[PDB]
Amino acid sequence: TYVSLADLERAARDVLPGEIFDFLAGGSGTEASLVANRTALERVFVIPRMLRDLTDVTTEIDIFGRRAALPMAVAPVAYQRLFHPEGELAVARAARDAGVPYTICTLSSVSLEEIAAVGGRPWFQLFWLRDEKRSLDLVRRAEDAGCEAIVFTVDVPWMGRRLRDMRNGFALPEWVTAANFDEFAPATWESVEAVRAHTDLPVVLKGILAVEDARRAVDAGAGGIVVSNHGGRQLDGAVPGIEMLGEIVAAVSGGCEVLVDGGIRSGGDVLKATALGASAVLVGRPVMWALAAAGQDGVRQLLELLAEEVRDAMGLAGCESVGAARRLNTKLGVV
Amino acid sequence: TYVSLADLERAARDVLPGEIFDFLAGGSGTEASLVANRTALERVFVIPRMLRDLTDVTTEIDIFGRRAALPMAVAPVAYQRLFHPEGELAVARAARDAGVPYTICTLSSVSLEEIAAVGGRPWFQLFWLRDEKRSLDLVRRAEDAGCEAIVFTVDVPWMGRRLRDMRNGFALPEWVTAANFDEFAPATWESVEAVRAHTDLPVVLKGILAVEDARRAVDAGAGGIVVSNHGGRQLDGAVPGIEMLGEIVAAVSGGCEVLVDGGIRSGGDVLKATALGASAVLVGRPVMWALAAAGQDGVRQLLELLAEEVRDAMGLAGCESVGAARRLNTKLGVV
Amino acid sequence: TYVSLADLERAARDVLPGEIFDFLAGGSGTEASLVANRTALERVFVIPRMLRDLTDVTTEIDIFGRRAALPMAVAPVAYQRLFHPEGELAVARAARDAGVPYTICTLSSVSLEEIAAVGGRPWFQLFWLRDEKRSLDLVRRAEDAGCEAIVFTVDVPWMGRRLRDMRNGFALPEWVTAANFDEFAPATWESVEAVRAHTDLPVVLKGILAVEDARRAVDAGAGGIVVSNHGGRQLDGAVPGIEMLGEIVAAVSGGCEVLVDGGIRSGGDVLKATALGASAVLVGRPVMWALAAAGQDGVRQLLELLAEEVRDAMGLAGCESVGAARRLNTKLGVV
Amino acid sequence: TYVSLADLERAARDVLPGEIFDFLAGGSGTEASLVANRTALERVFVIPRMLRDLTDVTTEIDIFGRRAALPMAVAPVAYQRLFHPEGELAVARAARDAGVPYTICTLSSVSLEEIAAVGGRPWFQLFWLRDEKRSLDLVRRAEDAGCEAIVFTVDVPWMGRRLRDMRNGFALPEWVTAANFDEFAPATWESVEAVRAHTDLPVVLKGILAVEDARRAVDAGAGGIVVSNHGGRQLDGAVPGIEMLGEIVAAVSGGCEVLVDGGIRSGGDVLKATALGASAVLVGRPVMWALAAAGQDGVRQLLELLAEEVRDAMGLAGCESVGAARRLNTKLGVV
Ligand SMILES: Cc1cc2nc3c(=O)[nH]c(=O)nc-3n(C[C@H](O)[C@H](O)[C@H](O)COP(=O)(O)O)c2cc1C
Ligand SMILES: Cc1cc2nc3c(=O)[nH]c(=O)nc-3n(C[C@H](O)[C@H](O)[C@H](O)COP(=O)(O)O)c2cc1C
Ligand SMILES: Cc1cc2nc3c(=O)[nH]c(=O)nc-3n(C[C@H](O)[C@H](O)[C@H](O)COP(=O)(O)O)c2cc1C
Ligand SMILES: Cc1cc2nc3c(=O)[nH]c(=O)nc-3n(C[C@H](O)[C@H](O)[C@H](O)COP(=O)(O)O)c2cc1C
Ligand SMILES: O=C(O)[C@@H](O)c1ccc(O)cc1
Ligand SMILES: O=C(O)[C@@H](O)c1ccc(O)cc1
Ligand SMILES: O=C(O)[C@@H](O)c1ccc(O)cc1
Ligand SMILES: O=C(O)[C@@H](O)c1ccc(O)cc1
Ligand SMILES: O=C(O)[C@@H](O)c1ccc(O)cc1
Ligand SMILES: O=C(O)[C@@H](O)c1ccc(O)cc1
Ligand SMILES: O=C(O)[C@@H](O)c1ccc(O)cc1
Ligand SMILES: O=C(O)[C@@H](O)c1ccc(O)cc1
């Protein structure tokens, strides 16, 4: 029985090979941004409300035309067969059963059509390829397979400097492949427009940190953004998304959904993100800890724990709905 | 001989069973709010005044129609027989002898009538029960028994996630029971009004952190509030009461008594709370350390030590009265 | 050869009995104010000036009608025979030879007349006694013996709670006595006026932290103040003097000399104090480390080291005089 | 293969004699300014831009009439034969090959003419000598030998207090000499004018921290300044250059080039400096680590690594040029 997400990290470190744990845990450069994602959440304190009606507390949201059970989705994480033989299928099944959106990756180790066939109304994460037509074909494949949103990753013109991976000499095992293929080009605003013109699905730009990039995303017709430094894996020294979130929420002024990720490790952290104005969060590494530890059942247990922590935090803060949580105030503290 | 409250924690850890010490010491979740209560006090520095008349320094206050010997009351702590066989009777006797109000709990391990019979003009802490009539009956019992205030706990719609208790598998021993009974409903503003209509006693709302909840408490006819995050035991990530206190004192503008709790560990901390505008503080865990260490005599020694530290701090700060201490200025520092 | 003041603390800890080292090193309560004195200096950074004329750098000041070789005096420290058999005579001789004022204490372990006979134009520190006439007699004795200023300590209505001393059971050895006597009353503004009326010497109020107490000191006819929390030995939680200094300097607006003490451990710290607006600093514990380590010669070496560090810091900061150092700007940093 | 600059420090500590490593690593006094240079960079976070054209990312700048391959030059470091037998020649050759300016020192252990003969369009660092004519002769020698800028060090009226060197009893080995000679006077604004009148080369004032000294530098006809606390080696307690940089850039308002140094340890740090407004950075200690570890080849590898890290950071931040990097915004964080 896991009582916190930290129980799952401990379990994952026990089971995973060192170099795979490092691929998962690590960030770029000195890992300043990786650590800052945690620091940034730990400095935020919530000002809870008391004495409100909690007779029907609901953690549900509506996002991109679907009801989700929590203000949370599984972040795109490449190559999930690194962590468990069932890889993406195990995670997608658990997410479906929990009513949480699952983000299918361009670099999934099981094909996007197979993962979509699990059900649960999935999203699809896009990397822009040097061959543009390949990019747009992936989008069409995703849409044909029933994916509900295109999560266009905009903070990877190329991969950051992963010093753990360099020092370990990390490479994919022969049994883990990019199953959507039988090489990255930097994406631009023109690429965003090409995607927006090629699909009826909401386009969500993942990796926005500058306020004017958030504004431009709305002007470009994005249905959402994810305020994110890519888990500290891209620019080392990039500001945490949680530190830009409030300013971005104010600037977009309801023009698109504003998600955040990086370091969400509890329902309390979800509450903090919501109180800062997020529509929803993504959770990355902890989902992989659960997958590594106990496969589909592990992910189920993680999502059940997160669901309980979110409900607990919301009610203790006087919030019968996620909208009420967005109206909570916060105060910065120390360490 | 104890020269600081930390001497008492050391003594309590030596004697108490691990799981009972954890029940006492612990907070919810990651214990962020528990630690922050201490951090928040440690960052506050007092700007003392010099050269004032100290020929009759008094630490007394008038609160809820009684003179108290210190600007302090014993916080409500459930199930005091966990810590010593005499439980609530030992603590209430020592509080009476020291001239400090004692808060009798809804979940007292000795009946409220027995504890009230000790004397010392006691307060009564109320949890709202699913059976409303039971709640109001407790209030009437408390009033009939001579309790002087109803401390309505408003931050426990349900109990927080106590991970130490979960990991220890903590349960009450068979010899510790809720002696007022022969199950919690979330309280609302309607519940507050039902209590206010059922008693002539001052109603004090314990667990207020939002400024508008403090204002609403005054509008609702509360005689006081306790600005509190429940010792870090309820919402993990709730702001410390000490960080909201000044803003709350300004907002209520003398409309009710404003108490604070969480992490008060010395007379200097009492002085800080007073300088930030508190009418009085509650002290929880240290009273239980003293009870565990040496029963009634332990609590007596703790209160004597606190009394000396409060007098010392006040005089060194140029304050002949608690009112003068409330007019002291403060300055935030680091670590 | 000592190259920093920290070399002297190490030497003093080696030689002194534990309880005497604790009497010297310790503060009140949790020692929060003791530690904060150091933290407060460490957070201040100087913005040095370049390319200024340094052909005649002088560290001299004029204060209370005497030229001093440095913007520094030896703080009042009671019972110096605790640290070395020559006690106050050793320190006073070294201070005289270095051109630094020495503060003779009310609780000196050698009589004030003997210490004054050393020469060097000494100051006299006054504690207010329950017998007022005794207080004023000490002032007259000091003036008759050639003391140049009365340093009236205003932050000791009684002694703070010295937990190291309590735990050690510290008491003076039989061979250390208060040599000025053959019991403290709290001083008030009336006491200050009684002293001011009884002497032509400048009266300096030591232990001022509140801005309005600094203003009142000027209105009361004080020739100076020492902005000070008594080395963290009095109110535990009192703000460091260095944190109030700039605001106090602005408020008194040249109306009296403004000294500071607490945690000065280098010439760089002297420069910081000067840049924040101090006329001069007092140095306490390090002078006693030097006395303990090597008697008069130790104090000589300490003052020579401090003199070199002050000259070094001033010149590197582009300051040919202490007045120029007072015009330096500062910036707060972290840790 | 080195993947970070920290790999090079480890390698240098392994090979160098302790006292030489200390000469290199150390700062003045308590090393507060040395540590603060690192702290100051670690607190700065970049707000990257996304989705910009990165088809021709260039790290080049034009400075003092030459194209440089990076916004970086090798800082002046005296006596490079302390670290490797080839000393300055090894470093200058690697800098030339990398297209990075190299600063030839007044206290070079190989003559300035020999180092200039390496090629690569070098700069010359000037210390003001007690014999003025000697100073101006060095300038003329430098200009005759093809140096492109005079980097006048303005923060060394004399050497700071290097406690590591004092404790080690550090002295130059007999085989390391000041090769430009067959003693320092404090420089003033008059000295700057004498240099400016004696050369057509741009004069760059190294060691400026005060905003009005930056303004005065422009008024005095400086072509650049280096905002610097001399690597924490001069005034202990001097503010880090990185903390003054933004204010200085605003004040000079394009009137001269504004460089910064102190603690640059990665391409990410270069990006931070650029985002705060620097034209370029200097790098000191890491170049010497590389020299100690592996001579010319070591310095080559260091500069290749820095070049890759700068390109990586710029592109991840959406910057196709250094000018675009200067337009990035930053946000302060914690630890
Ligand atoms: C092992 C790993 C692989 C990832 N792969 C991708 C990816 O292919 N596409 C993408 O947009 N983000 C990717 N991310 C970033 C995550 O979507 C997310 O931004 C980050 O993990 C969130 O932080 P968290 O792990 O702290 O919850 C990856 C993260 C990790 C740890
Ligand atoms: C073991 C324990 C039991 C508690 N029981 C109650 C309770 O029944 N009702 C209540 O309002 N507060 C309860 N509290 C909270 C305290 O009244 C108080 O808010 C908190 O302990 C103050 O912080 P301190 O312990 O840091 O002094 C309890 C606290 C502890 C540690
Ligand atoms: C052992 C000791 C004895 C002291 N005695 C006196 C005293 O008799 N009168 C007084 O005004 N201050 C006294 N002080 C306070 C000092 O004058 C001074 O405020 C403090 O030591 C300055 O801080 P520093 O020790 O950090 O330099 C004493 C301090 C110490 C450490
Ligand atoms: C061993 C050593 C010698 C130095 N010699 C000189 C010098 O002769 N002239 C000068 O202007 N700066 C000198 N500096 C300062 C550097 O130019 C530069 O300001 C500092 O090293 C930059 O910080 P960094 O080492 O953190 O990169 C020296 C620094 C070191 C570490
Ligand atoms: O300034 C803010 O309030 C915001 O940028 C912020 C959010 C989280 C945090 O930890 C620090 C700052
Ligand atoms: O963070 C990752 O590992 C993932 O986003 C990624 C995978 C391949 C790649 O080229 C760049 C990024
Ligand atoms: O802003 C304040 O002054 C107040 O919120 C506060 C009180 C105590 C504290 O530690 C930090 C902040
Ligand atoms: O903090 C506690 O333990 C106390 O307030 C409490 C007791 C029972 C309960 O259901 C909720 C809270
Ligand atoms: O606010 C200030 O500048 C002043 O109070 C201060 C001085 C020193 C210090 O460390 C912190 C604050
Ligand atoms: O700090 C001290 O020890 C000194 O100021 C002092 C001495 C005797 C006393 O009663 C009070 C203070
Ligand atoms: O105030 C600022 O923004 C600037 O002085 C600064 C730069 C870097 C830093 O770490 C702290 C402050
Ligand atoms: O930092 C140094 O070591 C260098 O700048 C220097 C060399 C000789 C000197 O006299 C002063 C400074």
Domains in chain A (CATH in brackets) are: 5-332 (3.20.20.70)
Cβ neighbours, 10 Å, residue C14: 10
Q: Whose CA is nearest to atom 4 of ligand 8?
A: B78
Q: What tokens were used for D263?
A: 């603690």
HEC sequence for chain A: CCCCHHHHHHHHHHHCCHHHHHHHHCCCCCCHHHHHHHHHHHCEEEECCCCCCCCCCCCCEEECCEEECCCEEECCCCCHHHCCCCHHHHHHHHHHHHCCCEEECCCCCCCHHHHHHCCCCCEEEECCECCHHHHHHHHHHHHHCCCCCEEEECCCCCCCCCHHHHHHCCCCCCCCCCCCCCCECCCCHHHHHHHHHHCCCCEEEEEECCHHHHHHHHHCCCCEEEECCHHHCCCCCECCHHHHHHHHHHHHCCCCEEEECCCCCCHHHHHHHHHCCCCEEEECHHHHHHHHHHHHHHHHHHHHHHHHHHHHHHHHCCCCCHHHHHCCEEEECCC
**A17 CB-near residues (< 8 Å, 6+ apart):** none
Helix (H), strand (E) at residue C206: strand C203-208
What is d(CA B102, CA B149) in angstroms, rounded to the nearest whole number?
A: 11
Experimental technique, in short, is X-ray
Q: How far apart are the first and last CA of chain A?
A: 29
Q: What is the largest CA-CA distance in chain D?
A: 59
What is d(CA D283, CA D306) in angstroms, rounded to the nearest whole number?
A: 10
Q: Where are the alpha helices (DSSP H) in C86-131?
A: 87-98, 112-117
Q: What is the C-alpha radius of gyration for chain D, rounded to an integer number of angstroms?
A: 19
C-alpha distances in angstroms, D249 versus A23, A37, A265, B252, D48?
40, 30, 40, 47, 20
Identify the active-site residue in D196, D206, D230, D272. Answer: D230
Q: What tokens were used for C111?
A: 């009589």
What is d(CA D140, CA D130) in angstroms, rounded to the nearest whole number?
A: 17
| Site of tokens 């260091």 | D302
What is d(CA A292, CA A109) in angstroms, rounded to the nearest whole number?
A: 15
Q: For residue D303, how far is the Cα from the chain centroid?
A: 14
Q: How far apart are the first and last CA of chain D?
A: 29
Instruction: Of C5, C19, C15, give the one whose Cα is nearest residue C287.
Output: C5
Distance C331 CA to ligand 9 centre (A): 9
Is the shortest distance between the CB of A184 and ligand 6 below 6 Å?
Answer: yes
Cβ pair B153, B127 in contact under 8 A: yes
| Site of tokens 């280098």 | C266
Signed CA dihedral, C61, C62, C63, C69: sign only: positive
Q: What angle do CA C157, C160, C161 make, to 5 degrees?
A: 145
Instruction: Of D92, D254, D107, D89, give the one whose Cα is nearest residue D181.
Output: D107
Q: What tokens were used for C154?
A: 């205003």
Instruction: Of B3, B25, B31, B27, give the one whose Cα is nearest residue B12.
Output: B25
Instruction: Of B302, B257, B275, B328, give the one whose Cα is nearest residue B62.
Output: B257
What is d(CA A25, CA D187) in angstroms, rounded to the nearest whole number?
A: 52
Residue C190 dihedral angles phi and psi, to the nearest 5°? -65, -40
Q: For residue B74, how far is the Cα from the chain centroid?
A: 5
Cβ pair C285, D126 in contact under 8 A: no
CB spacing of B45 vs C29 below 8 angstroms? no
What is d(CA C260, CA B329) in angstroms, rounded to the nearest whole number?
A: 20
What is d(CA A128, CA A100) in angstroms, rounded to the nearest whole number?
A: 26
Nearest to A3 among B167, B188, B240 (CB): B167
Instruction: Of A241, A42, A233, A252, give the one whose Cα is nearest residue D47.
Output: A241
What is d(CA C329, CA C323) in angstroms, rounded to the nearest whole number?
A: 13
Burial class (CB in 10 A: 0-12, 13-18, 19+), B254: exposed
Task: Compute the half-sphere exposure of residue B98: CA atoms within 13 Å on the CB side of its CA.
Answer: 30
Helix (H), strand (E) at residue D165: helix D163-168
Identify the active-site residue in B81, B230, B272, B300. Answer: B230
Residue B106 dihedral angles phi and psi, to the nearest 5°? -50, -40
Q: Whose CA is nearest to atom 3 of ligand 1?
A: A77
| Site of tokens 């199930």 | B79
Is the shortest distance between the CB of A278 and ligand 5 below 6 Å?
Answer: no
What is d(CA C159, CA C170) in angstroms, rounded to the nearest whole number?
A: 14
Residue type, D88: E
C-alpha distances in angstroms, C93 versus C71, C100, C113, C156?
18, 10, 14, 28
Residue B181 dihedral angles phi and psi, to the nearest 5°? -115, 155
Q: Whose CA is nearest to atom 2 of ligand 6?
A: A78
Cβ pair A268, A309 in contact under 8 A: yes
Helix (H), strand (E) at residue B226: strand B224-227
Cβ pair C151, C113 in contact under 8 A: no
**Gaps in chain B with C–N over 2.5 Å, residue before each:** 182
What is d(CA A266, CA B29) in angstroms, rounded to the nearest whole number?
A: 9
C-alpha distances in angstroms, B144 versus B116, B136, B153, B221?
10, 12, 20, 21
CB spacing of B29 vs A334 below 8 angstroms? no
- Whether A198 sits among the annotated catalytic residues: the reply is no
Residue type, C267: G
**D331 CB-near residues (< 8 Å, 6+ apart):** A239, A243, A244, D44, D45, D47
What is d(CA B245, CA B259) in angstroms, rounded to the nearest whole number?
A: 9
Could you tell me if residue C231 is left (phi over 0), alpha (psi between -120 and 50 degrees) or otherwise beta? left
Cβ pair C81, C176 in contact under 8 A: yes
Instruction: Of B39, C300, D270, C233, give the one whose Cα is nearest residue A331.
Output: B39
CB spacing of C316 vs D155 below 8 angstroms? yes
Q: What tokens were used for C203?
A: 């009266």
Cβ pair B190, B208 in contact under 8 A: no
- Active-site residues of C, by number, are 230
Nearest CA in chain B to C43: B334
Burial class (CB in 10 A: 0-12, 13-18, 19+), B239: buried
C9, C49, C50, C314: best mutation site toward chain D, by most D Cβ within 10 Å? C50
Instruction: Of A36, C134, C263, give the one whose Cα is nearest residue D268.
Output: A36
For a ligand 6 pocket test, name from A37, A103, A106, A107 the mutation site with the most ligand atoms within 8 angstroms of its C-beta: A107
How does DSSP classify residue C23?
Answer: H
Q: What tokens were used for A301?
A: 């247990």
What is d(CA A79, CA D110) in angstroms, rounded to the nearest whole number?
A: 55
Instruction: Of A328, A255, D295, give the one whose Cα is nearest residue B238.
Output: A328
Q: What is the DSSP string of B246-299?
A: HHHHHHHTTSSEEEE-S---SHHHHHHHHHTT-SEEEE-HHHHHHHHHHHHHHH
How does DSSP classify residue C17?
Answer: -
**D228 CB-near residues (< 8 Å, 6+ apart):** D155, D206, D207, D208, D209, D241, D260, D261, D262, D282
Identify the active-site residue in A230, A265, A272, A285. Answer: A230
What is d(CA C237, CA C69) in angstroms, rounded to the nearest whole number?
A: 34
Is the shortest distance between the CB of C107 and ligand 10 below 6 Å?
Answer: yes
| Site of tokens 């004397």 | B119
For a ligand 2 pocket test, name from B103, B233, B299 the mutation site with the most ligand atoms within 8 angstroms of its C-beta: B233
Which residues of chain A neighbour D272 with C-beta distances below 8 Å?
237
Instruction: Of C184, C186, C193, C207, give the one whose Cα is nearest residue B53.
Output: C186
What is d(CA C33, CA B178) in angstroms, rounded to the nearest whole number?
A: 44
Helix (H), strand (E) at residue C245: helix C241-252
Instruction: Of D73, D53, D51, give the one whose Cα is nearest residue D61.
Output: D73
Instruction: Of D127, D123, D24, give the one whose Cα is nearest residue D75.
Output: D123
Estimate the share of chain B in helix, then strand, then coil, as percent rounded to the nearest 5. Answer: 45, 15, 40
Cβ pair D63, D121 in contact under 8 A: no
Helix (H), strand (E) at residue B329: strand B329-332
Cβ pair D23, D170 in contact under 8 A: yes
Instruction: Of D164, D217, D226, give the one whose Cα is nearest residue D195.
Output: D217
Strand A44-47 to A329-332 pairing: antiparallel
Burial B54-85 (b: 16+ CB within 10 A, else e): beebebebebbeeebbbbbbbbbbbbbbbbbe
Could you tell me if residue A23 is left (phi over 0), alpha (psi between -120 and 50 degrees) or otherwise beta? alpha
Cβ pair D109, D79 in contact under 8 A: yes
Cβ pair A99, A307 in contact under 8 A: no
CA dihedral (D102, D106, D110, D113) in degrees, to 10, reads: 70
Distance A209 CA to ligand 5 centre (A): 13
How does DSSP classify residue B184?
Answer: B
What are the CB-based long-range contacts (under 8 Å, 24+) for C291-295?
C291/C80, C291/C83, C291/C84, C291/C87, C291/C90, C291/C91, C292/C11, C292/C12, C292/C15, C292/C16, C292/C83, C292/C84, C293/C8, C293/C11, C293/C12, C293/C15, C294/C11, C295/C84, C295/C86, C295/C90
Interface of B with A in 116-175 (CB under 8 A): 154-155, 157-158, 160-161, 163, 166-167
Q: What tokens were used for B202?
A: 């001052």
Q: What is the DSSP string of B115-142?
A: HHHT-S--EEEEPPBSSHHHHHHHHHHH
